Coordinates of C-alpha atoms and ligand atoms in Angstrom, one line a residue:
Chain A
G19 CA -37.5 42.4 -105.6
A20 CA -40.6 41.2 -103.9
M21 CA -42.8 38.5 -105.3
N22 CA -46.5 39.4 -106.0
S23 CA -49.4 38.7 -108.4
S24 CA -47.6 40.8 -111.1
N25 CA -44.6 38.5 -111.4
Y26 CA -46.5 35.3 -110.6
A27 CA -45.6 33.2 -113.6
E28 CA -41.9 33.7 -112.8
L29 CA -42.4 30.8 -110.3
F30 CA -42.8 28.4 -113.2
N31 CA -39.9 29.4 -115.4
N32 CA -36.7 27.4 -115.6
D33 CA -34.6 29.3 -112.9
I34 CA -34.5 27.0 -109.9
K35 CA -36.2 28.6 -106.9
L36 CA -37.3 27.6 -103.5
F37 CA -40.0 28.9 -101.2
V38 CA -39.1 28.7 -97.5
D39 CA -41.8 28.9 -94.9
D40 CA -40.8 29.0 -91.2
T41 CA -44.3 29.2 -89.7
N42 CA -44.2 25.7 -88.3
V43 CA -40.6 25.6 -87.1
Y44 CA -41.2 26.7 -83.5
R45 CA -44.5 25.2 -82.2
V46 CA -45.8 25.2 -78.6
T47 CA -48.8 24.4 -76.5
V48 CA -49.6 26.9 -73.8
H49 CA -50.7 25.4 -70.4
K50 CA -51.2 26.2 -66.7
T51 CA -48.6 25.2 -64.1
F52 CA -49.5 23.7 -60.8
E53 CA -48.9 27.2 -59.3
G54 CA -51.4 28.7 -61.7
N55 CA -48.8 30.3 -63.9
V56 CA -48.6 29.8 -67.7
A57 CA -45.9 27.9 -69.4
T58 CA -45.2 26.6 -72.9
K59 CA -44.2 23.1 -74.0
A60 CA -42.5 22.9 -77.4
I61 CA -43.6 20.3 -79.9
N62 CA -41.8 19.1 -83.0
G63 CA -41.9 21.4 -86.0
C64 CA -40.7 21.6 -89.6
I65 CA -39.3 23.9 -92.2
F66 CA -41.3 23.9 -95.4
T67 CA -39.0 24.3 -98.4
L68 CA -40.7 23.9 -101.7
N69 CA -39.7 24.0 -105.4
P70 CA -42.9 25.3 -107.0
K71 CA -42.0 24.1 -110.5
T72 CA -41.3 20.5 -109.6
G73 CA -43.3 20.0 -106.4
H74 CA -40.2 18.8 -104.6
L75 CA -40.6 19.4 -100.9
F76 CA -37.6 19.3 -98.5
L77 CA -39.3 18.8 -95.1
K78 CA -36.7 19.4 -92.4
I79 CA -38.2 18.1 -89.2
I80 CA -37.2 20.3 -86.1
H81 CA -37.0 18.2 -83.1
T82 CA -37.8 19.8 -79.7
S83 CA -34.4 18.9 -78.5
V84 CA -33.0 21.8 -80.6
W85 CA -34.7 24.2 -78.1
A86 CA -33.3 22.8 -74.9
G87 CA -31.6 25.4 -72.8
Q88 CA -32.0 28.1 -75.4
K89 CA -33.4 31.6 -74.9
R90 CA -35.5 33.8 -77.2
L91 CA -36.8 30.8 -79.1
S92 CA -39.0 32.7 -81.6
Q93 CA -35.9 34.6 -82.7
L94 CA -33.7 31.5 -82.6
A95 CA -36.2 29.7 -84.8
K96 CA -35.6 32.1 -87.7
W97 CA -31.8 31.6 -87.5
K98 CA -32.1 27.9 -87.1
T99 CA -34.3 28.0 -90.3
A100 CA -31.7 29.9 -92.1
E101 CA -28.9 27.6 -90.9
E102 CA -30.8 24.5 -92.2
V103 CA -31.7 26.1 -95.6
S104 CA -28.0 27.1 -96.1
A105 CA -27.0 23.5 -95.2
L106 CA -29.6 22.2 -97.7
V107 CA -28.2 24.4 -100.5
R108 CA -24.6 23.4 -99.7
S109 CA -25.7 19.7 -99.9
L110 CA -27.1 20.1 -103.4
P111 CA -24.9 19.8 -106.5
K112 CA -24.1 23.2 -108.0
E113 CA -26.5 22.7 -110.9
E114 CA -29.4 21.9 -108.5
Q115 CA -28.8 24.9 -106.2
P116 CA -31.5 27.6 -106.4
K117 CA -31.0 30.9 -108.1
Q118 CA -33.5 32.6 -105.7
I119 CA -35.0 31.7 -102.3
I120 CA -38.3 33.3 -101.6
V121 CA -39.2 33.6 -97.9
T122 CA -42.9 33.8 -96.9
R123 CA -42.2 36.1 -93.9
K124 CA -40.0 39.2 -94.1
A125 CA -38.4 38.3 -90.7
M126 CA -36.5 35.6 -92.5
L127 CA -34.7 37.9 -94.8
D128 CA -31.8 39.0 -92.6
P129 CA -31.2 35.6 -91.0
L130 CA -31.1 33.9 -94.5
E131 CA -29.1 36.6 -96.1
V132 CA -26.4 36.3 -93.4
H133 CA -26.3 32.5 -93.6
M134 CA -26.0 32.7 -97.4
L135 CA -23.2 35.3 -97.5
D136 CA -21.1 32.5 -99.2
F137 CA -23.7 32.5 -102.1
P138 CA -23.8 36.1 -103.3
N139 CA -25.5 35.1 -106.5
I140 CA -28.5 33.5 -104.8
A141 CA -31.1 36.2 -104.5
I142 CA -33.1 36.2 -101.3
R143 CA -36.6 37.7 -101.9
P144 CA -39.7 38.4 -99.9
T145 CA -43.3 38.1 -101.2
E146 CA -46.5 40.2 -101.0
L147 CA -48.5 37.0 -101.5
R148 CA -50.3 35.6 -98.5
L149 CA -49.5 32.0 -99.1
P150 CA -51.2 29.3 -97.0
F151 CA -48.1 27.1 -96.4
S152 CA -48.8 27.2 -92.6
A153 CA -51.5 24.7 -93.3
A154 CA -49.0 22.1 -94.4
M155 CA -49.4 20.5 -91.0
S156 CA -53.0 19.9 -91.9
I157 CA -51.8 17.3 -94.5
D158 CA -52.1 14.1 -92.4
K159 CA -49.0 12.3 -93.7
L160 CA -46.8 15.4 -93.1
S161 CA -48.1 15.9 -89.6
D162 CA -47.6 12.2 -88.8
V163 CA -43.9 12.2 -89.8
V164 CA -43.2 15.5 -87.9
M165 CA -44.9 14.3 -84.7
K166 CA -43.3 10.8 -84.7
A167 CA -39.7 12.0 -85.2
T168 CA -37.4 11.3 -82.3
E169 CA -34.4 13.2 -83.7
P170 CA -33.6 15.7 -86.5
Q171 CA -34.7 14.4 -89.9
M172 CA -35.1 15.5 -93.5
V173 CA -37.9 13.9 -95.4
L174 CA -38.4 14.4 -99.1
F175 CA -41.9 14.5 -100.7
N176 CA -43.5 15.6 -104.0
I177 CA -46.4 17.8 -102.8
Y178 CA -48.0 17.5 -106.3
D179 CA -48.2 13.7 -106.2
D180 CA -48.2 12.7 -109.9
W181 CA -50.3 15.8 -111.0
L182 CA -47.5 17.0 -113.3
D183 CA -48.1 14.0 -115.6
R184 CA -51.4 15.6 -116.6
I185 CA -51.3 19.4 -115.6
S186 CA -48.7 22.2 -115.7
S187 CA -46.8 23.5 -112.7
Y188 CA -48.9 26.8 -112.8
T189 CA -52.1 24.7 -112.5
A190 CA -50.5 22.4 -109.9
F191 CA -49.4 25.2 -107.7
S192 CA -52.8 26.8 -108.0
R193 CA -54.4 23.6 -106.9
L194 CA -52.0 23.2 -104.0
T195 CA -52.6 26.8 -102.8
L196 CA -56.4 26.3 -103.1
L197 CA -56.3 23.1 -101.0
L198 CA -54.0 24.7 -98.4
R199 CA -56.1 27.9 -98.3
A200 CA -59.2 25.7 -97.7
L201 CA -57.5 23.7 -94.9
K202 CA -56.3 26.9 -93.3
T203 CA -59.9 28.5 -93.5
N204 CA -61.8 25.5 -92.1
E205 CA -59.8 22.4 -91.6
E206 CA -62.6 20.1 -90.7
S207 CA -64.8 21.0 -93.7
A208 CA -61.8 21.0 -96.1
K209 CA -60.8 17.6 -94.9
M210 CA -64.4 16.3 -95.1
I211 CA -64.5 17.5 -98.8
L212 CA -61.3 15.6 -99.6
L213 CA -61.9 12.3 -97.7
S214 CA -65.8 11.8 -97.4
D215 CA -66.1 9.5 -100.5
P216 CA -64.5 6.1 -99.7
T217 CA -64.0 4.8 -103.3
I218 CA -61.2 7.4 -103.9
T219 CA -57.8 6.3 -102.3
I220 CA -54.6 8.0 -101.3
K221 CA -51.8 5.9 -102.7
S222 CA -49.1 4.9 -100.3
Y223 CA -46.6 7.1 -102.0
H224 CA -48.9 10.1 -102.3
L225 CA -50.3 12.8 -100.0
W226 CA -53.6 13.6 -101.7
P227 CA -56.4 11.3 -103.1
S228 CA -56.2 9.8 -106.5
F229 CA -58.9 12.1 -108.1
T230 CA -59.7 11.8 -111.7
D231 CA -59.6 15.0 -113.7
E232 CA -63.3 15.4 -113.4
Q233 CA -63.3 14.8 -109.7
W234 CA -60.6 17.4 -109.3
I235 CA -62.8 20.0 -110.9
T236 CA -65.6 19.1 -108.5
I237 CA -63.2 19.1 -105.5
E238 CA -61.6 22.4 -106.6
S239 CA -65.1 23.9 -106.9
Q240 CA -66.1 22.6 -103.5
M241 CA -63.0 24.2 -101.9
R242 CA -63.8 27.6 -103.5
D243 CA -67.2 27.5 -102.1
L244 CA -65.9 26.7 -98.6
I245 CA -63.3 29.6 -98.8
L246 CA -65.3 32.5 -100.4
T247 CA -68.4 31.4 -98.2
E248 CA -66.1 31.7 -95.2
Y249 CA -64.5 35.0 -96.6
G250 CA -68.3 35.5 -96.9
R251 CA -69.1 35.4 -93.2
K252 CA -65.6 36.8 -91.9
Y253 CA -66.7 40.1 -93.7
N254 CA -70.6 40.4 -94.2
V255 CA -69.6 40.5 -98.0
Chain B
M26 CA -1.3 81.9 -83.5
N27 CA -1.1 81.2 -87.2
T28 CA -2.5 82.8 -90.3
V29 CA -4.1 81.7 -93.6
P30 CA -3.8 84.7 -95.9
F31 CA -5.7 85.4 -99.1
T32 CA -4.2 86.8 -102.4
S33 CA -7.7 88.7 -102.7
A34 CA -11.6 88.0 -102.7
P35 CA -12.7 88.4 -106.3
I36 CA -16.2 86.7 -106.0
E37 CA -18.7 87.1 -103.3
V38 CA -18.6 84.1 -100.9
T39 CA -19.5 82.9 -97.5
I40 CA -16.3 81.7 -95.8
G41 CA -16.2 79.5 -92.8
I42 CA -13.4 78.4 -90.6
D43 CA -14.5 75.6 -88.1
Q44 CA -17.8 76.7 -86.5
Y45 CA -17.5 80.4 -87.7
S46 CA -19.1 81.6 -90.9
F47 CA -18.8 85.1 -92.4
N48 CA -19.6 86.8 -95.8
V49 CA -17.1 88.6 -98.1
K50 CA -18.4 90.8 -100.8
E51 CA -17.3 90.7 -104.4
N52 CA -13.9 92.5 -104.6
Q53 CA -14.0 93.4 -101.0
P54 CA -10.6 94.2 -99.4
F55 CA -10.2 90.9 -97.6
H56 CA -6.8 89.2 -97.1
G57 CA -7.4 86.3 -94.7
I58 CA -7.9 84.9 -91.2
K59 CA -5.3 85.4 -88.4
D60 CA -5.0 84.1 -84.8
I61 CA -5.8 80.6 -85.8
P62 CA -5.2 78.3 -82.8
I63 CA -2.2 76.0 -83.0
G64 CA -2.6 72.5 -81.9
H65 CA -5.8 71.5 -83.8
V66 CA -6.7 70.6 -87.3
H67 CA -8.8 73.2 -89.0
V68 CA -11.2 73.4 -92.0
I69 CA -11.6 76.5 -94.1
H70 CA -14.8 76.2 -96.3
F71 CA -16.6 78.2 -99.0
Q72 CA -20.0 78.7 -100.5
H73 CA -20.3 81.0 -103.4
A74 CA -23.0 83.6 -103.4
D75 CA -24.2 82.7 -106.9
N76 CA -24.1 78.9 -106.7
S77 CA -25.0 77.6 -103.2
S78 CA -24.4 74.3 -104.9
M79 CA -21.1 72.8 -103.7
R80 CA -19.8 73.8 -100.4
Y81 CA -16.0 73.1 -100.6
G82 CA -13.1 73.4 -98.3
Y83 CA -9.7 72.4 -97.1
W84 CA -8.6 70.5 -94.0
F85 CA -5.2 71.8 -92.7
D86 CA -2.8 72.0 -89.8
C87 CA -0.7 75.2 -89.7
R88 CA 2.1 73.3 -88.0
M89 CA 2.6 71.4 -91.3
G90 CA 3.3 74.5 -93.5
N91 CA 2.4 78.0 -94.6
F92 CA -0.9 77.9 -96.4
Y93 CA -2.7 80.7 -98.3
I94 CA -5.8 81.0 -100.4
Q95 CA -6.1 82.4 -104.0
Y96 CA -9.2 82.6 -106.3
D97 CA -8.6 80.6 -109.6
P98 CA -10.7 82.2 -112.3
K99 CA -10.3 79.2 -114.7
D100 CA -11.5 76.5 -112.3
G101 CA -13.8 79.0 -110.5
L102 CA -12.9 78.3 -106.9
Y103 CA -10.8 79.5 -104.0
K104 CA -7.7 77.2 -103.8
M105 CA -5.5 76.5 -100.9
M106 CA -1.8 76.5 -101.7
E107 CA 1.5 76.1 -99.8
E108 CA 4.2 78.9 -99.8
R109 CA 7.6 77.2 -99.0
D110 CA 9.5 80.5 -98.9
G111 CA 9.0 81.2 -95.2
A112 CA 10.6 84.7 -95.2
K113 CA 8.3 85.8 -98.1
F114 CA 5.1 84.4 -96.5
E115 CA 6.0 86.2 -93.2
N116 CA 6.4 89.5 -95.2
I117 CA 3.1 89.0 -97.1
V118 CA 1.3 88.2 -93.7
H119 CA 3.0 91.1 -91.7
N120 CA 1.9 93.5 -94.6
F121 CA -1.8 92.4 -94.4
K122 CA -1.7 92.5 -90.5
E123 CA -0.4 96.0 -90.4
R124 CA -3.1 97.2 -92.8
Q125 CA -5.7 95.3 -90.7
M126 CA -7.0 93.4 -93.7
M127 CA -7.6 90.1 -91.9
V128 CA -10.5 88.8 -89.7
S129 CA -9.6 87.4 -86.2
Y130 CA -10.3 83.8 -85.2
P131 CA -11.8 84.7 -81.8
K132 CA -10.5 83.3 -78.5
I133 CA -13.6 82.7 -76.3
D134 CA -12.9 82.4 -72.4
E135 CA -14.8 79.0 -71.6
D136 CA -14.6 77.6 -75.2
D137 CA -13.7 74.0 -76.1
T138 CA -16.3 73.9 -79.0
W139 CA -13.6 73.0 -81.7
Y140 CA -11.4 70.8 -79.4
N141 CA -14.3 68.6 -78.4
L142 CA -15.3 68.1 -82.1
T143 CA -11.7 67.4 -83.3
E144 CA -10.1 65.7 -80.2
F145 CA -9.1 62.5 -82.1
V146 CA -8.8 64.0 -85.6
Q147 CA -5.3 64.0 -87.0
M148 CA -4.0 65.4 -90.3
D149 CA -2.1 62.3 -91.1
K150 CA -5.3 60.2 -90.9
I151 CA -7.3 62.8 -92.9
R152 CA -4.7 62.5 -95.7
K153 CA -5.2 58.7 -95.9
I154 CA -8.9 59.1 -96.2
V155 CA -8.5 62.0 -98.8
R156 CA -5.6 60.9 -101.0
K157 CA -3.8 63.8 -102.7
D158 CA -0.2 63.2 -101.6
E159 CA 1.5 66.3 -103.2
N160 CA -0.4 68.6 -100.8
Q161 CA -0.2 68.8 -97.0
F162 CA -3.9 69.9 -96.9
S163 CA -7.0 68.0 -98.0
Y164 CA -9.9 69.1 -100.2
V165 CA -13.4 68.0 -99.6
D166 CA -16.8 69.0 -101.2
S167 CA -20.4 68.2 -101.1
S168 CA -20.3 65.7 -104.0
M169 CA -17.4 63.5 -103.3
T170 CA -18.4 59.9 -102.9
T171 CA -17.0 57.3 -100.6
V172 CA -15.2 54.0 -101.5
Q173 CA -18.2 52.1 -100.3
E174 CA -20.6 54.3 -102.2
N175 CA -18.5 53.5 -105.4
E176 CA -18.9 49.7 -104.8
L177 CA -22.7 50.0 -105.2
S178 CA -16.8 56.5 -109.9
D179 CA -13.6 58.5 -110.1
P180 CA -11.2 56.8 -107.5
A181 CA -8.9 59.8 -107.1
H182 CA -11.7 62.1 -105.9
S183 CA -13.1 59.6 -103.3
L184 CA -13.4 59.5 -99.6
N185 CA -11.5 56.4 -98.5
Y186 CA -13.4 55.8 -95.2
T187 CA -13.0 52.3 -93.6
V188 CA -15.7 50.2 -95.1
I189 CA -18.3 48.9 -92.6
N190 CA -20.9 46.4 -93.7
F191 CA -22.9 44.5 -91.1
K192 CA -23.9 41.8 -93.7
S193 CA -20.5 40.9 -94.9
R194 CA -18.1 38.0 -94.4
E195 CA -15.7 40.4 -92.6
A196 CA -18.5 41.1 -90.1
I197 CA -19.8 37.5 -89.6
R198 CA -17.7 34.6 -88.5
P199 CA -18.7 31.3 -90.2
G200 CA -20.7 29.4 -87.5
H201 CA -21.4 32.5 -85.5
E202 CA -24.0 33.9 -87.9
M203 CA -26.7 34.7 -85.5
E204 CA -24.2 35.6 -82.6
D205 CA -22.2 38.0 -84.6
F206 CA -25.1 39.7 -86.4
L207 CA -27.0 40.4 -83.3
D208 CA -24.0 41.2 -81.1
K209 CA -21.3 43.0 -83.2
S210 CA -18.5 42.9 -80.5
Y211 CA -16.4 40.6 -82.5
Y212 CA -16.5 42.9 -85.5
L213 CA -16.0 46.0 -83.4
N214 CA -13.2 44.8 -81.1
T215 CA -11.3 42.3 -83.2
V216 CA -11.9 43.1 -86.8
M217 CA -12.0 46.9 -86.6
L218 CA -10.3 48.1 -83.4
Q219 CA -7.5 45.5 -83.1
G220 CA -7.1 44.8 -86.8
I221 CA -7.9 47.9 -88.9
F222 CA -7.8 51.0 -86.6
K223 CA -5.4 49.6 -84.1
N224 CA -6.8 51.8 -81.2
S225 CA -10.1 53.5 -80.3
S226 CA -8.4 57.0 -80.8
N227 CA -8.1 56.3 -84.6
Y228 CA -11.7 54.9 -84.7
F229 CA -13.0 58.1 -83.0
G230 CA -10.9 60.3 -85.3
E231 CA -12.5 58.9 -88.4
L232 CA -16.0 59.1 -86.7
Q233 CA -15.4 62.8 -85.9
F234 CA -14.0 63.5 -89.4
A235 CA -17.0 61.9 -91.0
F236 CA -19.4 64.0 -88.9
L237 CA -17.6 67.2 -89.7
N238 CA -17.6 66.5 -93.5
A239 CA -21.3 65.6 -93.3
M240 CA -22.1 68.8 -91.4
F241 CA -19.9 71.3 -93.2
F242 CA -20.3 70.0 -96.7
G243 CA -23.5 67.9 -96.8
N244 CA -21.4 64.9 -97.9
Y245 CA -24.1 62.1 -97.8
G246 CA -21.5 59.3 -97.6
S247 CA -19.8 61.0 -94.6
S248 CA -23.2 61.0 -92.9
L249 CA -23.6 57.3 -93.7
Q250 CA -20.1 56.5 -92.3
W251 CA -20.7 58.5 -89.1
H252 CA -23.9 56.7 -88.4
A253 CA -22.3 53.3 -89.3
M254 CA -19.6 53.9 -86.8
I255 CA -22.0 54.9 -84.1
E256 CA -24.2 51.8 -84.9
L257 CA -21.3 49.4 -84.8
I258 CA -20.5 50.5 -81.2
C259 CA -24.1 50.6 -79.9
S260 CA -24.8 47.2 -81.4
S261 CA -21.9 45.6 -79.5
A262 CA -22.6 44.1 -76.1
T263 CA -18.9 44.2 -75.2
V264 CA -17.3 47.6 -75.4
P265 CA -14.5 49.0 -73.2
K266 CA -16.0 51.3 -70.6
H267 CA -13.7 54.2 -71.5
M268 CA -14.8 54.0 -75.0
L269 CA -18.5 54.3 -74.2
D270 CA -17.8 57.2 -71.9
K271 CA -15.8 59.0 -74.6
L272 CA -18.4 58.2 -77.3
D273 CA -21.0 59.8 -75.2
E274 CA -18.9 63.0 -74.9
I275 CA -18.2 62.9 -78.7
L276 CA -21.8 62.6 -79.7
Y277 CA -22.9 65.1 -77.2
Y278 CA -20.8 67.9 -78.7
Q279 CA -21.7 66.8 -82.2
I280 CA -25.5 67.1 -81.4
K281 CA -24.9 70.3 -79.6
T282 CA -23.1 71.9 -82.6
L283 CA -25.6 70.6 -85.3
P284 CA -27.6 73.4 -86.9
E285 CA -31.1 72.9 -85.7
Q286 CA -32.5 73.4 -89.3
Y287 CA -30.3 70.6 -90.7
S288 CA -31.2 67.9 -88.1
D289 CA -34.1 66.7 -90.3
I290 CA -31.7 65.2 -92.9
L291 CA -28.4 65.0 -90.9
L292 CA -29.8 62.6 -88.3
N293 CA -31.0 59.1 -89.2
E294 CA -34.1 58.3 -87.2
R295 CA -33.5 54.5 -87.2
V296 CA -30.0 54.5 -86.0
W297 CA -30.5 57.0 -83.2
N298 CA -33.7 55.4 -81.9
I299 CA -32.1 52.0 -82.1
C300 CA -28.9 53.3 -80.5
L301 CA -30.6 55.3 -77.6
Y302 CA -33.6 52.9 -76.9
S303 CA -33.0 49.4 -78.2
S304 CA -29.3 48.7 -78.4
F305 CA -26.9 47.1 -75.9
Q306 CA -25.7 50.6 -75.1
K307 CA -29.2 52.1 -74.7
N308 CA -28.3 53.1 -71.1
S309 CA -24.7 54.1 -71.7
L310 CA -25.0 57.4 -73.4
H311 CA -26.6 59.6 -70.8
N312 CA -25.3 62.9 -72.0
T313 CA -26.1 62.2 -75.6
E314 CA -29.6 60.9 -74.8
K315 CA -30.3 64.0 -72.7
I316 CA -29.3 66.5 -75.3
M317 CA -31.2 64.6 -78.1
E318 CA -34.4 64.4 -76.1
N319 CA -34.3 68.2 -75.3
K320 CA -33.2 69.4 -78.7
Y321 CA -34.7 66.9 -81.2
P322 CA -37.6 65.1 -79.4
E323 CA -39.3 64.9 -82.8
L324 CA -36.9 62.5 -84.3
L325 CA -37.7 60.1 -81.4
Ligands
VSX29 C1 -0.1 86.7 -104.2 C2 0.5 85.4 -104.6 O1 0.5 85.1 -105.8 N1 1.1 84.6 -103.7 C3 1.0 84.7 -102.3 C4 0.0 85.5 -101.7 C5 -0.3 85.2 -100.4 CL1 -1.7 85.6 -99.5 C6 0.5 84.3 -99.6 C7 1.5 83.7 -100.1 C8 1.8 83.8 -101.4 N2 2.7 83.1 -102.2
VSX30 C1 -18.1 86.3 -83.6 C2 -17.1 86.3 -84.7 O1 -16.1 86.9 -84.6 N1 -17.3 85.7 -85.9 C3 -16.4 85.7 -86.9 C4 -15.3 84.8 -86.9 C5 -14.4 84.9 -87.9 CL1 -13.2 83.9 -88.0 C6 -14.6 85.9 -88.9 C7 -15.6 86.8 -88.9 C8 -16.5 86.7 -87.8 N2 -17.6 87.5 -87.8
VSX31 C1 -29.1 65.3 -100.8 C2 -28.7 65.4 -99.3 O1 -28.9 66.3 -98.6 N1 -28.2 64.3 -98.9 C3 -27.9 64.2 -97.5 C4 -26.6 64.7 -97.1 C5 -26.3 64.4 -95.8 CL1 -24.8 65.0 -95.2 C6 -27.1 63.8 -95.0 C7 -28.3 63.3 -95.4 C8 -28.7 63.5 -96.7 N2 -29.9 63.0 -97.1

C-alpha cells in the first residue's frame, strides 16, 4: 500500500527498499526565440534513488543527449526513469535487490511496474509523504557532477556522510529531510545557515559539513526556524 | 421455426428468451416457447419471483438438438435437457401446440435486434468458455466467476474467457515497455488476433457473449471482460479498418439494447471516456459515440 506517517518506521527495518524520485530527470530552461516564440533547452538531469536505511544514493545522471529527436519528453522521462531503475536492480546481486521500491510521484507507478514485470516479488508503492528530494540539486556536489557530465553516468554517494556512526537511520533520514525541506523552502538562507561559519569543513568525501553533535542541534534548530517561519508567511499562521 | 417446450411451470418465474421477458404464475398452464428463429444462438433465462437473487439461463442452438425445460424441485431451478427421441419430442410439441399452451417468439418486420447482438457468437465457442461437455447447451448465472477472477474458486463452474492483462509479460515485449503499454497494437494484432483468437470474428464473438452475460445475468466478470476487449482495441493505434467499423456497429447495438436503469453499473466511466475521447480510436466510433452522448450523457 501507500507510504505515510502511519507506517513511517517501516523505512528503517531490515527489508531492503529504495525511494525513487524522478523530479530532476527532465530539466529545461525556457527562453525566447529570435522570432519572439518560446522554446525549451534541456539541461542534464538525474534520477535520485535512495536507500533510506543505509544512505546509499544511486545518482543516475541523465545527459541531454537522451532527449535528442524524442517527442513527449515529460512522458518519456518517466519511462526512462523506470528503465534505469530496472537496470539498476538487475545489476545488483539478488541479496542486494530491493523488496520494495517507493516512488515519490504516482505517475511513476505504471512505468515502473511495467519495467519490473520480471520481478513480481518487488512491491512498487506510492507515498502520501511530500518528500523534498527535488531539492537534491541544491546540494552543491550533486549539482556539480550532474552539470559537468558529458555522457550518461552513475555516481554513488552516501547522502548521510558518516552520520550513521553516531545516529540511527531514523534520525539520519529526519535530518536529511529537514535539510532538504529547508533548501527547498529558501535555498539561499538554508545554504547560508549551513556554510556561514568558515571553521566547519566539508570533507572531500562528504556532502555536508563536519558538524559536531552540538552544532547539528543548533543547525537543525536553525533550519526549523527558517521552515516554519516561511510556512509562517506563506499562510498568515 | 423451433420450439423449447416445458414439462410444466411449478414456481412463479420471470422467463426471458433473448430481449423478451414475460411472467409465468405458479402452476400456470405454460408449456414453452415456439417459433424460435433458426440460425442464431439463443438464451433462455429465469428469475424466480421469490428470490430475485440469481438470474440463470441456458445458451443453446436449436440446430444442435431438441431441448426442453423441466423444474427440478430438489435443486430448485428450471433445467434445460436434451430429448434424443426425435419422434417423441415432436409428439410432445405437437400436443402442446394444438392446445395453444406455448407463447410465440414474435417475428417483427424491420427487426435485427438479436442478429446484431449475436452476429459473431457461435455455440461451439460458447461451449469452450462454459465447459460442460456432456451437454450441447451452456448454463450461466449471476455468480459464476471468470478464470481471471479466480487468479486474484471452483474451476468447473467458471467462465473461461480469454485472459487480458495490460500489465503482463504477454502484453509487453521486453525492450518495448513504453511502446507496447501506450500502444497496444502488438498485443491486439499479434498476441490476441493472430495467436489466440485467430481472426476478428472470434474476438468479436467473445466480446458479444461477454456483454450478453453481463446484461442478462449481471455477471461482473463478463462486464470486466467486455470492457477489457473494447479497451484493447481502442488503445491500439493500428487496427484494421474493417474491425473498427464493425466494432462501432457492435457497440452501438449493445448500447441501444442496454436497459437505461442498469447503465449506472453496466458501463465503466473510465473505459468509455478513455475510449471515446482520449484513445487512438476516439474518432473511429461515430455511431457508438452518438448514441452514448444522446442516451447516457451523464457517464461522460
Ligand atoms: C415430461 C418429461 O419428463 N419429458 C419431456 C417433456 C417435454 Cl416438454 C419435452 C421432452 C420430454 N422428454
Ligand atoms: C411482445 C411480446 O410478444 N413479448 C413476448 C415475447 C415472448 Cl417470447 C413471450 C411473451 C411475450 N409477451
Ligand atoms: C454487484 C454488481 O452488480 N456487480 C456488477 C455486475 C455487473 Cl454485470 C456490472 C457491474 C457490477 N458492479
